[PDB]
Amino acid sequence: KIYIKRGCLPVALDELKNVMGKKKAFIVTDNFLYNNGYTKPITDKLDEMGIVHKTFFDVSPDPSLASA
Amino acid sequence: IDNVEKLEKALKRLREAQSVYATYTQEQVDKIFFEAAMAANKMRIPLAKMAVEETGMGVVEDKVIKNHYASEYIYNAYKNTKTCGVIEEDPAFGIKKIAEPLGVIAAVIPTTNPTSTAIFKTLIALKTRNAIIISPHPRAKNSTIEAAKIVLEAAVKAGAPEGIIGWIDVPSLELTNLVMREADVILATGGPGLVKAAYSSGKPAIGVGAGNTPAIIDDSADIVLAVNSIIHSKTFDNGMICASEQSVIVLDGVYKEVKKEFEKRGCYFLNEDETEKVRKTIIINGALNAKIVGQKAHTIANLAGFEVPETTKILIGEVTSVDISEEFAHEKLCPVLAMYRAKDFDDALDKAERLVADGGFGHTSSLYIDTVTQKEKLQKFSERMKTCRILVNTPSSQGGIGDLYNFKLAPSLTLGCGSWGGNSVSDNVGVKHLLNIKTVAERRENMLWFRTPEKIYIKRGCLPVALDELKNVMGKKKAFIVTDNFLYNNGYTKPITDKLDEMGIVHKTFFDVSPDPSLASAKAGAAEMLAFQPDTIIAVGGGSAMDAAKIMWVMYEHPEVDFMDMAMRFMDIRKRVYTFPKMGQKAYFIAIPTSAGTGSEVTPFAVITDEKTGIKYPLADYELLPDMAIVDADMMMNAPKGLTAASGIDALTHALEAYVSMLATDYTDSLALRAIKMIFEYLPRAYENGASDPVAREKMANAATIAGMAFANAFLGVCHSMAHKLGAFYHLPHGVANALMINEVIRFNSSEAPTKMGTFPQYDHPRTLERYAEIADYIGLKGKNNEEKVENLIKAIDELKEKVGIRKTIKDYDIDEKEFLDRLDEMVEQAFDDQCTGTNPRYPLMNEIRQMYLNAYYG
Amino acid sequence: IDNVEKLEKALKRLREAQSVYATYTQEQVDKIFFEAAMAANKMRIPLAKMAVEETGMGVVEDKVIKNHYASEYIYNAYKNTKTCGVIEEDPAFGIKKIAEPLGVIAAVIPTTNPTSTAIFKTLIALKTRNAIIISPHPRAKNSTIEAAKIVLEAAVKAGAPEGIIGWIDVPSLELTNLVMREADVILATGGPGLVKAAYSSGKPAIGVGAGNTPAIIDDSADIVLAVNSIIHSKTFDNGMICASEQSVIVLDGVYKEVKKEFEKRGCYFLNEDETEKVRKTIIINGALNAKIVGQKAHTIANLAGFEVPETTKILIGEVTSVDISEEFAHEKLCPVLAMYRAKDFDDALDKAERLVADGGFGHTSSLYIDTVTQKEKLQKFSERMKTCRILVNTPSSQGGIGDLYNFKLAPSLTLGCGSWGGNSVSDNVGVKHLLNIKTVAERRENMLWFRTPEKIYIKRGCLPVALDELKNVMGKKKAFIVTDNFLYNNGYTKPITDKLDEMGIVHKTFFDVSPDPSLASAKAGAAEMLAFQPDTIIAVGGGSAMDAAKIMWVMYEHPEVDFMDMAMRFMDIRKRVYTFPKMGQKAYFIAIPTSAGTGSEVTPFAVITDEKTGIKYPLADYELLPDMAIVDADMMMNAPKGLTAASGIDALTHALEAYVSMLATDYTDSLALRAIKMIFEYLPRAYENGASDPVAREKMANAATIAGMAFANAFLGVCHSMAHKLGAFYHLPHGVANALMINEVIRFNSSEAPTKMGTFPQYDHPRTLERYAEIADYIGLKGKNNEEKVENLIKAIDELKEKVGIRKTIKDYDIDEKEFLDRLDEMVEQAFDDQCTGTNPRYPLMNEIRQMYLNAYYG
Amino acid sequence: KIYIKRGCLPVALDELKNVMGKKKAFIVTDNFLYNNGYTKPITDKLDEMGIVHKTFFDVSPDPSLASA
Ligand SMILES: [Fe+3]
Ligand SMILES: [Fe+3]
């Protein structure tokens, strides 16, 4: 399930509920990306469905074992 | 305004001023709204006094409360709403919603709320950059004009166009009917007989119904709360406001307590003579009396012909008849109330449903109940009642316009009733019903994908080492081999049967798969597996065997499936009407090919022919991917010359159509080009030398698998839609059927000006000639101007067909001409109705299909 | 069905079937929808062939596309949309929605889309549990009836009622008029005349408008994309589908390139004679020709009188005029096209607006632009175009029915054109337009609050310790003391100034505040504060001092505030029109009382008298809470006897009103009870002894502050509403005015059958008698049946008034009777229109207030 | 600003936007409450108002200094 073309993020994320039925999501991102709000569309989409999400942004470049 | 000509002049000036007001910003609208709200808020007492003096009905204090509500709660509700520009925006898509004013509104005003309704409507018209005509009632015109002037002066002082609000000085039927026919939208609140004209005026309208409001009191309820709420609601403004209780139904077990409380809190119960007098004085000639509305209970009693204590609040009459004959079942805007008795909750529900109909059908109803214990009764009441407002433990008069007792309910003085009441709102009319919503849409492209089966194994002699994965990473102990009779007879399952027997797996084999498999064989195989209870399904053989095994797997794991529903034409594979069931639980599928060019071990296609009509249905869904697609070259050696030629040509056609397809993405173009190069460079060597040249056979198998993936991710074109029918009508092999039509399709797709296009978001213009030129350049014909390259490619394909022993024309395959021309019409009709023609860049018509297929048959 | 009586019988059967259908569950409706979707999708080619053979215009393949669309895309837009029961559920409030069906739909089908529209309407009606009757066009009866049958015999087989779908076999004008008037809703397509009649019927109508569609092409756009999209949309189904590009506007920058691109791909540009012939053949007597719609360009040219190559697609004639007289400016349902030359973007917008307003007002328009580097032009286009659909870089025919080129747009025919075209839709008609939504509302209560100023300091001699915090903690530099003349002249501000001097803080004192503070004193104080710029404000004194200092603080922090706007009456303190500006930006507001019975150090109330009108304007908002209120008994040990008595009685009245308030809660109740007990126990000792009794003075201080808190959190009643006016009209002390009215107000409120009620959700039934009995029981009085207790309470209040030397009646304070009788009518009017009136647990009328005034005067 | 009576949580929380203007919220709660979805009424209103929020739910009975 490799998905291509623009604007495919919400359409691809539709499969989490309609086909798969998942309930809990754990976003792993970067502090630089999280501060500017690069996970905003994903969290907004997961809110449109009955999915609860938790974000973890304590990851640094050259990720060390402590963050893992 | 007392003449027609003045009316057109006023309408013209109002349209001119609205054309200016419609281009204001949010800040100016907020300023005007705030100033008008304050000006209307600080003049409640004089307006109420004027309304009471003019109409001669109602009480001053409740009118003051109504004015305060209509001037303050409206502002508190709609001060923070956005009604100017972009409301909703989704940058991922192209959607953009823009709010625009509605136009010039024509509003009518009743006598029940001469001033509060005018204030509310003027405020909501000012908020939405609209213009309004007020049509005052002939009996209460002065107060309405005064309220309109009060709002208008503040609006124009705040920086609004002068001619925003208009009004009719002396109203008449002709003037109102002319106003209604010219305005864009009509706001009707004047009751029936006028709302019907508004709806039959020829313009969009927003009207209101009204009528009887049943109230239910049952055993599990607070008697004091219910009685006092009913008294408050009924006595608010002498019951003149609509949406107030007109009848109360009390269950049998609490009748005495309710009657005692009603008597204690100051209500007078009528006896038979009093009931007769009251019911005779309420309705005159089948119509509500005009001198009884808004008057006190004492005045009603005096007019009826008797006397009551001066402190009586509600006249209550106990009745039994619910039909229209009873005169207490009618609506009445006065403190007279009717009381009913019920022996059970179902009887109360039946009674209340007769009282809502024929009266306030779709308006409102009330129920007093304990909402913690009696959960089922609440559901039953909610389901049964055909009213747009269902109130629980709330007074009806203040709950119909509810922002006082309940929140998240629109605070409106105009109450729609839905299709039940003969109007089109079904909600409290708010600020969102006076706006137009424009949708701006940007062109977006369809989402694509790239799906392949897992664990694709590519090397010689990999079959034993790969089959070692059983009982190593899994626990499969039962195998069901599906093969062909020819392969089974020559012992081609021996390398697999020996390997399975070496490990601890029992196996059963099925070898009743004829070429062009029939549905009966698939059903027999499914029944055999159902009797055998296998764990994994191994499909060995050519394309027909693998497709038949796929169908058997589908019928084995979901024995309730209907074949005719699966073979169903769809426009978009993601928007299928029929959804294939999930299939991964009862069996594990492995595909081992012996024929090369079919390439069905990496594709979702399972094309099979019918058992009765012999029609080829190409059913395809991504639930059919044969995971663990193993390719072994040593099993691919003993193929005769004809089979190799047909397989090679079929693989070449697969690669060509995958490259030129409309859904062809960049992830597949590389595979298509590589497969085309491989097939062109190595097919003759494998065809002539045979099994003595293992390199050619290995390269041909690899090219076939690559092209299989290529056309698995990108669907075919019209050549396959023609070749399927050609092979089903005259029993020709699939490869040679594809071979005889490729040149015509190449010449058909290559056209700068086609009659029809493919209708795809990303195929924005004909590009097929450039794609074929790219194919020619990659393969190395070195032509000129993108046209000679296509001709060179056609000539090269013809030469390749010559070198592999494919005859030039269909006529050379011993086909009678008369039967050909007799079946041509049916064959064209079936060819157009195929799944493969959907993704073709040109979308061929039937006449073009016939012309091309005749060209291919004649030369 | 070809006669009126047959139609009426059919309508009765339809209603009977819909009544049974309207109670189906979700699973059943899902099954009906699914089976109907298969039935409509399978028979896609036969219906297209039937329609093209019957109608005589159109192309078979595009009709097949439309038939496939109207089933597949409709099914996969609402397959899992909940529409049976509770769709919204908010447990915190009482809101719940039911989404009930609508009833009977009268469908009016056009001739351009006979089958697809019928399938779409039937499916959407089936999904919403409605019943539909179809009135086909006379020219295309059979195809529509056949499509309805194909859907119906599958819906019935799936488990649905029998006569859900009905149709009129032989349509007529009278039959259509009858079926429009007898149906619940009218869903109408087919352009003007029929929609005008549908809206002029008297029933809700959802109608379709139609008209032109201009396509703007500017300098910065893909020429190939724009040209090919326009060609595709225009040639789709020979252009009978609505919203097709009837004109094109191209700027001179790319005019020649666009012309070359059109010429390259199958188009014909007319000359002067051909344009004239085409103009004379499109329009006949100011109307569209019926023999030109749906045919190819070759046939149109043949009827015109010239010849064109058989492969031509579009005929284009260059025109400059854009008025109504031009025959190329109308909407043509044929492949004929008109080209316009525009100097710049503004000229193109002006022309497009003219085409939209003259013709397709509100339908749709198209723009081809670069959406990345032309934001301002795109925004101007979105703002100026008055069409419900605005498509950018999208073909109009496939863009209007949007599920192909843009998602998140409703896939549907039946496009509503909004109030611009004369129909109340302004959207794409879908499922949500065929439902009635019922609102279930449960009784909810307003939230309450407990707001007090921070840092309340309460002991004897705590003033120096409290003021020491001004430097060691906050760090202020400038102080502005406000007091009154008499309090200043006797040196009661000496300790404060001494402490400020010791701390080293510069201070300035303003003391020109007179009793009954006016606006002149407040303005002078604010001017002094502006000139001095203090960092903290210290308000020392009684009632006048705190109110004057609060007004000076407000005018000092926000000098643009109008006083007549803060003095406006509100129903809910949290829903008022005027919002107070935030305070505390500049200075603190420490408050030190020198009397007991005002409570102003803990309340948000202020009151001042205008100099000219001479009437008090109480105002209240929690932005006036004096932070760090200091209550020291040393500052107020030497008050005279009359002031002590008046203050004690005012505090007692505050506590009583706070207890019997509608907004009363436990927090205020405990404080009110304690204050009442302390006032009853210690007031005579303070009055008779004075400074010789410090314990009584301190207890009275604490009781006054506690009562202040109590009536700050819960508002007052009706005694203050008339006491303020009594004190203002005849110049009496506030406590004296309170004393003369509390006894009659207690009896007024104590009533089991009040004329009106306070209309507060928390106040279900009258309970003031029980509250007064609770007060009497807490004090220590004796009685029976909750009435003798209240009588004993009144007697005790009379005894307390007698002890502290307060007279019995108003007339005992030397007020003329003629003056009272000549000012009573104005005094009652002023008293009713007061802020304190709306909180009383018994809504007063004017006559009741006048009667209370007379009883107070005459005893 | 002590707020009482039932159904006052959304009305009180509305002040976070319509009065003050905050933009980031840090919810602190216990394991049991978070697992049983008792913070959902608050997070729903925060999402409706348009306020980013993050939840810490790692507190225990008789809390220690490590959790703080
Ligand atoms: Fe094939
Ligand atoms: Fe007071």
Author numbering:
A (entry chain F), D (entry chain C): 465 to 532
B (entry chain E), C (entry chain D): 11 to 869
Cite, word for word, the article reporting this structure.
The main pathway for ethanol production in C. thermocellum involves the bifunctional aldehyde-alcohol dehydrogenase (AdhE). AdhE functions in the anaerobic fermentation pathway and contains two domains: an aldehyde dehydrogenase (ALDH) domain for the reduction of acetyl-CoA to acetaldehyde and an alcohol dehydrogenase (ADH) domain to reduce acetaldehyde to ethanol. Both reduction processes natively use NADH as a cofactor and are reversible in the presence of NAD+ as a cofactor. Structurally, AdhE is an intriguing protein as it forms large, filamentous helical ultrastructures termed spirosomes, that could be necessary for function.
Using standard cryo-EM techniques, we were able to determine a 3.28 Å cryo-EM structure of the extended C. thermocellum AdhE spirosome. We determined that the native state of the C. thermocellum spirosome is extended (different from that of other structurally characterized AdhEs) and contains an enclosed channel between the ALDH and ADH active sites. The first is the buried area located between two molecules of AdhE, in a domain-swapped dimer interface, where one ALDH domain is sandwiched between the ADH and ALDH domains of the second protein. The second interface is between the dimer of dimers, here referred to as the tetramer interface. This interface has a much smaller interaction area because it only occurs between two ADH domains. However, the calculated buried surface area differs between the two E. coli dimer interfaces, but not the tetramer interface. Both the E. coli and C. thermocellum extended dimer interfaces bury ~5000 Å2. We found that more salt bridges form in the extended C. thermocellum structure as compared to the extended E. coli structure, which suggests that this may be a factor in the stability of the extended C. thermocellum structure that is not found in the E. coli structure. At the ADH active site, we observe an empty density in the C. thermocellum extended structure, coordinated between residues that have been implicated in the ADH activity of the protein (circled in red). We see that there is density, most probably a water molecule, being coordinated by H734, D844, and C846. While the channel can be found in both the compact and extended structures, we see that the channel in the compact conformation has areas that are exposed to the cytosol, whereas the extended channel is entirely enclosed.
